[PDB]
Design a protein around this ligand. Structure first.
Ligand SMILES: CCCCCCCC/C=C/CCCCCCCC(=O)OC[C@H](O)CO
Ligand SMILES: CCCCCCCC/C=C\CCCCCCCC(=O)OC[C@H](O)CO
Length: 375
């Protein structure tokens, strides 16, 4: 499902680029996405443009899946112990620090564009795993597990740090209702509730309470995915079945719809001097240099001073290639960019997207080349 998921994602992005650039469709594409919307449901109203609504829904579902996965990794997978978590965690710290530092090298003096610091810290898990899948049985499963954990730690870390920066966007009552909802999820888990539906219902309450803040609405999905029990009772667990049923819908519908609504950008007026502007160049440097350099360097240090061990079945060369692949930020990076610039100016988000596209495509091509050499 990895290879076909990546291919369908790329098709949707190409269709977006066609929509945003052809005279027959460009007008409607942009006008529809820009439309202000307010949904009627009692004494509870909220105003957001069409694209933001779409992204909130799609990313709530995607990060519900991310929540299930990270909980499974912390309880059963490669994050279930210090011994196994050391290497992916140190790698993710590097993949966070170095891309941010290279982005801010260009953008720290700009009070507007510095808000996009996390853009090249993101990794498009579907795209990167799809490029891995192109080598088939030559890829050690441990390498895929490593890439998955790395990307999820960086993506969740970005979302969480941004959420902490954005807390002031929520009201006292919103935070209160959210706290009570999270507490209900916790007691449901600790007591032994195993029907997925009850968690989903309390989860939509949590999601609506923090819906004014897109990043918090996204984090709500993670929280719900985290508190759905994973204990294998009689060979069954609601988290396993939910992840299994949800994964195809995310890989084949949610993420392609997101890419179709977000990856299309006009190419008229774009220039070589425009691409070398601080915002797109900071993104490109973060992805093409920051990601592989941070991941490889922090991993090398972890191994040399014996802080961590290579995952069995992998080599350090393979880890370096994964470091390149983690520069494929694509849809996750576009989402981070919408969180930073979405409510500021269309020129900013479009140039951020152009930078993301150059960095992502270049990371994919270079990573696949090195992958063919090493595997
Ligand atoms: C804002 C800060 C960044 C937020 C980043 C979000 C991602 C969180 C997961 C990464 C840490 C992994 C923790 C691994 C801890 C070791 C696990 C352990 O030793 O626990 C033993 C226990 O038996 C277990 O079942
Ligand atoms: C409210 C902030 C709380 C943050 C607590 C996180 C602590 C985790 C540290 C280890 C991972 C490395 C994290 C490095 C994160 C990049 C630096 C950063 O977040 O600051 C960028 C700044 O916003 C540009 O304007």
């Amino acid at each position: 499902s990895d290879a076909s998921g990546g291919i369908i994602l790329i098709i949707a992005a190409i269709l977006a680029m066609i929509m945003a650039n052809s005279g027959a469709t460009s007008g409607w594409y942009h006008d529809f996405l820009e439309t202000p919307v307010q949904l009627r449901v009692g004494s509870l109203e909220i105003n957001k443009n069409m694209l933001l609504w779409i992204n909130d829904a799609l990313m709530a579902v995607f990060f519900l899946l991310v929540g299930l996965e990270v909980k499974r990794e912390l309880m059963q997978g490669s994050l279930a112990s210090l011994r196994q978590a050391a290497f992916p965690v140190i790698a993710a710290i590097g993949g966070m620090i170095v891309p941010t530092l290279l982005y801010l090298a260009f953008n720290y003096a700009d009070p507007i564009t510095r808000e996009g610091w996390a853009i090249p810290a993101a990794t498009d898990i579907a795209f990167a795993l799809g490029v891995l899948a192109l080598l088939g049985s030559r890829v050690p499963l441990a390498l895929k597990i490593f890439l998955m954990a790395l990307a999820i730690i960086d993506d969740l870390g970005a979302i969480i740090i941004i959420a902490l920066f954005y807390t002031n966007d929520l009201s006292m009552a919103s935070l209160g209702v959210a706290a009570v909802a999270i507490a209900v999820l916790a007691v449901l888990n600790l007591c032994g509730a195993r029907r997925t539906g009850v968690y989903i219902l309390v989860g939509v309450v949590l999601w609506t309470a923090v819906l004014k803040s897109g990043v918090h609405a996204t984090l709500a999905g993670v929280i719900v995915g985290f508190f759905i029990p994973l204990k294998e009772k009689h060979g069954r667990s609601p988290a396993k079945r939910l992840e299994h049923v949800l994964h195809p819908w995310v890989a084949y519908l949610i993420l392609p719809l997101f890419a179709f609504a977000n990856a299309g950008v006009s190419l008229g007026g774009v220039t070589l001097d425009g691409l070398t502007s601080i915002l797109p160049l900071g993104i490109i440097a973060g992805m093409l240099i920051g990601k592989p350099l941070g991941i490889s360097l922090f991993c090398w240090l972890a191994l040399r001073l014996k802080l961590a061990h290579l995952p069995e079945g992998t080599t350090y060369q393979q880890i370096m290639v994964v470091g390149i692949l983690c520069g494929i930020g694509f849809t996750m990076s576009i989402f981070i960019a919408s969180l930073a610039f979405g409510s500021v100016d269309p020129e900013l988000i479009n140039w951020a997207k152009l930078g993301i596209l150059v960095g992502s495509i270049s990371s994919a091509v270079i990573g696949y080349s090195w992958l063919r050499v090493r595997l």
